[PDB]
């Protein structure tokens, strides 16, 4: 089995902000959902070739995960806080989309969003 190639982190002529607002997104809610018990699953790609799920990528298509967003916003990879709050969303909708209602990982995604949700309320104004 082969895992595909993990979403960009890098891309030099992709034009990039530094703004109140991304700070935000990594030092509160980046920072946030890092350090939760539940963070783990979500912290790097999903491995499906080590979780034994050659179906993973056949049913997601736009993968998203922790790790990825945490290096966009080290290597400020981002115009607006919009593309990454679009990333976080894609990370929890990809774990709906994927796995069953109750699941331990729906659960886990669940309590990640409440916390995504709390937090992007008092997103910045720029
Ligand atoms: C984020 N993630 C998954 O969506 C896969 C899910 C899983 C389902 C069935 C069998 C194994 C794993 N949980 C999971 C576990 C570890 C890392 C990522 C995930």
């Not at 703004?19 to 699953?41: D, G």
């Not at 400020?76 to 976080?88: G, K, L, R, S, T």
């Not at 916390?115 to 104004?125: R, S």
Request: glycine residues 2%.
């Amino acid at each position: 089995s082969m895992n595909p190639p993990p979403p960009e982190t890098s891309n030099p002529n992709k034009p990039k902000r530094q703004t109140n607002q991304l700070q935000y997104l990594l030092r509160v809610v980046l920072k946030t959902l890092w350090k939760h018990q539940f963070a783990w699953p979500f912290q790097q790609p999903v491995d499906a070739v080590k979780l034994n799920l050659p179906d993973y990528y056949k049913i997601i298509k736009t993968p998203m995960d922790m790790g990825t967003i945490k290096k966009r916003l080290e290597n400020n990879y981002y115009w607006n806080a919009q593309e990454c709050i679009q990333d976080f969303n894609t990370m929890f909708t990809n774990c709906y989309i994927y796995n069953k209602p109750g699941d331990d990982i729906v659960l886990m995604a669940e309590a990640l969003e409440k916390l995504f949700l709390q937090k992007i309320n008092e997103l910045p104004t720029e």
